[PDB]
Design a protein around this motif. Sequence first.
Motif, PDB file in Angstrom:
ATOM      1  N   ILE A  42      -6.426   2.826  -5.163  1.00 56.02           N
ATOM      2  CA  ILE A  42      -5.346   1.862  -4.893  1.00 56.02           C
ATOM      3  C   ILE A  42      -5.752   0.978  -3.710  1.00 56.02           C
ATOM      4  CG2 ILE A  42      -2.986   1.599  -4.013  1.00 56.02           C
ATOM      5  CD1 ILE A  42      -2.353   4.322  -5.388  1.00 56.02           C
ATOM      6  N   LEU A  90       3.351   7.326  -6.632  1.00 53.96           N
ATOM      7  CA  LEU A  90       2.630   8.507  -7.095  1.00 53.96           C
ATOM      8  C   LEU A  90       3.422   9.749  -6.732  1.00 53.96           C
ATOM      9  CD1 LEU A  90      -0.959   7.651  -5.870  1.00 53.96           C
ATOM     10  CD2 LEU A  90      -0.115   7.325  -8.177  1.00 53.96           C
ATOM     11  N   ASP A  91       3.968   9.763  -5.520  1.00 56.80           N
ATOM     12  CA  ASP A  91       4.771  10.893  -5.073  1.00 56.80           C
ATOM     13  C   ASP A  91       6.018  11.025  -5.942  1.00 56.80           C
ATOM     14  OD1 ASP A  91       5.242  12.951  -2.723  1.00 56.80           O
ATOM     15  OD2 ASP A  91       7.173  11.990  -3.054  1.00 56.80           O
ATOM     16  N   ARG A 113      -4.736  13.075  -6.432  1.00 53.82           N
ATOM     17  CA  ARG A 113      -3.882  12.106  -5.742  1.00 53.82           C
ATOM     18  C   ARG A 113      -4.678  11.307  -4.709  1.00 53.82           C
ATOM     19  NH1 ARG A 113       2.055  14.862  -4.510  1.00 53.82           N
ATOM     20  NH2 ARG A 113       2.381  12.774  -3.629  1.00 53.82           N
ATOM     21  N   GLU A 114      -5.659  11.948  -4.088  1.00 58.28           N
ATOM     22  CA  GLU A 114      -6.445  11.268  -3.079  1.00 58.28           C
ATOM     23  C   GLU A 114      -7.396  10.247  -3.672  1.00 58.28           C
ATOM     24  OE1 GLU A 114      -9.230  13.478  -0.559  1.00 58.28           O
ATOM     25  OE2 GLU A 114      -8.223  12.374   1.068  1.00 58.28           O
ATOM     26  N   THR A 155       5.351  -1.827  -7.547  1.00 55.37           N
ATOM     27  CA  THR A 155       4.903  -2.583  -6.379  1.00 55.37           C
ATOM     28  C   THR A 155       5.608  -3.915  -6.156  1.00 55.37           C
ATOM     29  OG1 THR A 155       3.088  -3.837  -7.437  1.00 55.37           O
ATOM     30  CG2 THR A 155       2.612  -1.586  -6.733  1.00 55.37           C
ATOM     31  N   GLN A 195      -5.276   7.275  -4.260  1.00 55.91           N
ATOM     32  CA  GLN A 195      -5.010   6.527  -3.042  1.00 55.91           C
ATOM     33  C   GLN A 195      -6.227   5.625  -2.809  1.00 55.91           C
ATOM     34  OE1 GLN A 195      -4.213   9.023   0.483  1.00 55.91           O
ATOM     35  NE2 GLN A 195      -2.050   9.026  -0.061  1.00 55.91           N
ATOM     36  N   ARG A 196      -7.411   6.241  -2.846  1.00 56.33           N
ATOM     37  CA  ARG A 196      -8.673   5.553  -2.615  1.00 56.33           C
ATOM     38  C   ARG A 196      -8.828   4.369  -3.542  1.00 56.33           C
ATOM     39  NH1 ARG A 196     -14.450   5.924  -3.912  1.00 56.33           N
ATOM     40  NH2 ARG A 196     -15.644   5.812  -1.965  1.00 56.33           N
ATOM     41  N   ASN A 220       1.632   4.259  -2.983  1.00 57.58           N
ATOM     42  CA  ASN A 220       1.500   5.654  -2.638  1.00 57.58           C
ATOM     43  C   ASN A 220       2.808   6.410  -2.847  1.00 57.58           C
ATOM     44  OD1 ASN A 220       0.083   7.945  -1.377  1.00 57.58           O
ATOM     45  ND2 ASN A 220       1.553   7.607   0.267  1.00 57.58           N
ATOM     46  N   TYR A 221       3.928   5.767  -2.521  1.00 56.67           N
ATOM     47  CA  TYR A 221       5.265   6.346  -2.694  1.00 56.67           C
ATOM     48  C   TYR A 221       5.512   6.595  -4.191  1.00 56.67           C
ATOM     49  CZ  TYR A 221      10.295   6.940  -1.576  1.00 56.67           C
ATOM     50  OH  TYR A 221      11.565   7.427  -1.360  1.00 56.67           O
ATOM     51  N   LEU A 270       0.846  -1.186   0.000  1.00 53.61           N
ATOM     52  CA  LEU A 270       0.000   0.000   0.000  1.00 53.61           C
ATOM     53  C   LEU A 270       0.881   1.234   0.000  1.00 53.61           C
ATOM     54  CD1 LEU A 270      -2.449   1.642   0.153  1.00 53.61           C
ATOM     55  CD2 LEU A 270      -2.658   1.155   2.595  1.00 53.61           C
ATOM     56  N   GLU A 271       1.794   1.310   0.960  1.00 57.81           N
ATOM     57  CA  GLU A 271       2.688   2.458   1.053  1.00 57.81           C
ATOM     58  C   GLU A 271       3.488   2.692  -0.241  1.00 57.81           C
ATOM     59  OE1 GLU A 271       3.309   4.680   3.538  1.00 57.81           O
ATOM     60  OE2 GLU A 271       1.843   3.848   4.948  1.00 57.81           O
TER      61      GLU A 271
END
Lengths: 457, 457, 203
Positions: B220, B119-120, B213-214, B143, B217-218, B116-117, B112-113
């Motif tokens: 993902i 996208l950043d 981005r949110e 991933t 996240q959702r 998210n990493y 998960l992290e």
Amino acid sequence: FQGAMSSSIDISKINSWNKEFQSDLTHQLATTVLKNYNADDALLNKTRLQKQDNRVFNTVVSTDSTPVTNQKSSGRCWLFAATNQLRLNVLSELNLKEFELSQAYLFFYDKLEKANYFLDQIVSSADQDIDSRLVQYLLAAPTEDGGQYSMFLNLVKKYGLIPKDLYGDLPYSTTASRKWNSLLTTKLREFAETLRTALKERSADDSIIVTLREQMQREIFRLMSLFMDIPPVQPNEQFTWEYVDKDKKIHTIKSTPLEFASKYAKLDPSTPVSLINDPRHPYGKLIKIDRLGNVLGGDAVIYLNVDNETLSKLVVKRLQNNKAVFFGSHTPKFMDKKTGVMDIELWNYPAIGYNLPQQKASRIRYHESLMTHAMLITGCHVDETSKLPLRYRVEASWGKDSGKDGLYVMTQKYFEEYCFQIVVDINELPKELASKFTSGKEEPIVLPIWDPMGALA
Amino acid sequence: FQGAMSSSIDISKINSWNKEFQSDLTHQLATTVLKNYNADDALLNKTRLQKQDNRVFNTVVSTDSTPVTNQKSSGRCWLFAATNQLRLNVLSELNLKEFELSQAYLFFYDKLEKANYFLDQIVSSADQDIDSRLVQYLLAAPTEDGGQYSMFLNLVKKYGLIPKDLYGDLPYSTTASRKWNSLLTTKLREFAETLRTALKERSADDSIIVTLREQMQREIFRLMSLFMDIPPVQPNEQFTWEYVDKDKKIHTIKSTPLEFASKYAKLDPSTPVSLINDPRHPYGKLIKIDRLGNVLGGDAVIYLNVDNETLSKLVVKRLQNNKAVFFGSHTPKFMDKKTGVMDIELWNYPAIGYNLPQQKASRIRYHESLMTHAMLITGCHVDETSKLPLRYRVEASWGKDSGKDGLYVMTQKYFEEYCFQIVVDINELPKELASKFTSGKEEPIVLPIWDPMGALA
Amino acid sequence: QAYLFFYDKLEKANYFLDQIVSSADQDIDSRLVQYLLAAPTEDGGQYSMFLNLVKKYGLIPKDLYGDLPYSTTASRKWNSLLTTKLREFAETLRTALKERSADDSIIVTLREQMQREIFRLMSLFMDIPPVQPNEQFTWEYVDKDKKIHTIKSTPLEFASKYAKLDPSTPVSLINDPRHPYGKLIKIDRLGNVLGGDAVIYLN
């Protein structure tokens, strides 16, 4: 002492030799590999396989061997090859997609006869000691599955042949005869003693001995009938066979085993003769295996010894006559079952410094090579430029998954070094060799019953 | 022209060379064998295996690793080895025949992290071209299951640790993550474009980008929750765990993932540091892998480069402290899974004239060697006569049927040539090296995100 | 067991050559020579043949020499390959003996080249043990308490000191109803180590 000392294994010597061998790279490589895999799997030479695995044959028989036969766990190769050679006549003459003569039919009588032959051998050798070479050899394996071509004709002359549809390999013991044989053999060994003991006091012809031998026959037959039924018809008794040709047409043939073997299988027991390449004896001579047989009073195993050139030309001639050739050899020497190749140089043994200079005649004399199986040559490739056969096509009786669909390719060299006997019809021979059979002045070289040139088991 | 000609493959040359090689016996033997079997199966040296396959270790940890863990079809080695090192504390402290910390717990959040990493990383590299080295590398495998020890502490600091009895490897995707990863990655690549496109017109901080981005996240998280459930309790949320000790006594522990990681697993995220033997850079220096991570804003992967003697002595010291040692290496180089042996000379390649003179630093620079897996050293054998370690005992996470009951024996030489990183507690280091971490004057050598000294996948 | 297996096979091959020389007077087809050629390197043996090996080579822990090699757990092919060679040498020896006596240096040399060749081929399928009978070896192990120990010994000393074997005490008894009881039975020529003890049973 000095001698025994020099002949002993000296620990310093082998360790010094070891050091020497380890300094050689080929040896280092060899011992690394040879500790990991079977030597045949490791040394198989694919570069050689690439060339020798050739399935193009310019001189072949016209009929196909369908389906592929499988003897399974028994030494019935000789019966499958002897009949695999004749069935072709039925297929051909009746137009059948598939056809098999019953190998089980011959197997049942062969075993019965042999057991009976054994008792006779014991009586005729009652004079020698129990530990004599002959008696101990007789007791070794009285009911083995293996046989010779003469033993095959002996059966056919007395019992004939019938279609497999009337008597097949149904019984467990036909495809796994070991236990059955073990059980009979144990009994035969019991009877061997009972007969020799009875013969101490009485003569072979004393009614007591005559009765005793008969009760033994009875007991042998009884036990046998427990593992296989006696064929459903007698040799001269009529049977009715219903079948279908390749056109889907139905036919009914009424015949007897004896008539069927001639009328349909086209077998005339008077024409086949066996030729052999046994370099231990002069060529042109007849060779006879003492005592070897199956049917009491039947024909003896006799071979006409000839050179390989002669033997090779006879195989080509027979194939040209459109007939497969029964032959015996030393299986599985230099025979690769996965690829179905019989080539004495298919494995790179000289790469590990392993060469075999011992020759044919000596291989035989020294217990290294003997006839062990029987197969059928159905084709061969003659070299155009006035040359001879380079390879032969071989049909085994081990199912379609053995070799290439049951087929093997054999080199000319293999045929010369690890094959010994072939069977042809006397009318295929030159008058020169045929007379060796027809005349009556040919005194055969007689070998011991245990000679390496015997039953193809 | 002359140059290109000389650099071309000339047919006469290779055929002449061929003839030369075929005249050598070692070569003839080698090519015969090497066409038949895998080179490792053929060249494995049993003479060497006999000596090197030694399972006697005089310096070992006191607790047993029971049961043997299996990551299956995933690159979760690092998580199993990181926890395989800590679980021992629970077993020991609670007296359990068996115990496992949940590797799936860390796996779920790690993935998960990372997503998210990713996208950043994309947003922060939106300035470079789509075909740039960095962006193409980011899109390659966002991933993957592999990770580093720093990435492991990053997870533990935020999420803690819980017993496996509360969240195990039940889901298909935990033991076969490829498809799951493929599905997420395809989406991430979709979002990479959606983000870069949106960033052409707007700044990273435009609420539009923040919202986008949110929603990502959702999305993902939603997809992830389809293949694995989110853990049953939050990091600071209490859980109730019921169990049995080796005496058959029942106990109930109430705790939180974060408290359990300290109170029972005994992990203090402030003490572990990673040392590495990377001969491409001077020793005594700190090495930092740019951008490599999992938790946004978490700690970076940093290694203290040291020589093997130092590295080897630290492993012995840690084992003497009764603690297993996490280490990374190049699996499966010179590793025999059937026997569980890691010996660079276990195969007789020099017997076929195959030698590898290229050294460690060059192997790394030239794309031949890199860290690929993480395992655990649970013992080692120090040579009495004032000597060092000769071999080490290694615990893998591939089940009991891998190696010898999951165990491997590694030579000192293998450790020096094909292992790179080990993890110890800073208080185990000499003030000399520890200060490298505690001071603030150590400027790290910074490597690219794609450097061979990275994630143990 | 592999330790004894390697030497047993080596010795037997060597014993075979000796049997051939001592029977060179009989015919190739004689009962004895044909029997000698039948299976010169079979794996089977007797207890006397076991003590013969132990007296000369000792015993060592399996941890120093196990069943690693393919041929130790599948000896048929290895045996076939050696046997074929031995049969080759049988002829080469008998032929050479027609013209010369067993002691002619020619025969002495020939037998040695054969030993060498037998050993060479054998070393291809199994390594010669890592230590000689009187050479020291070092063995590290663990007891049932997880304690480590190192024993330094020789194969010959280990066989007595640790395996507790005294080759002078074992005797074989047999129930062979073909002969009177109370009698000693001896199997002629059966052996493995040239000059070793014969197979003898007390019926």
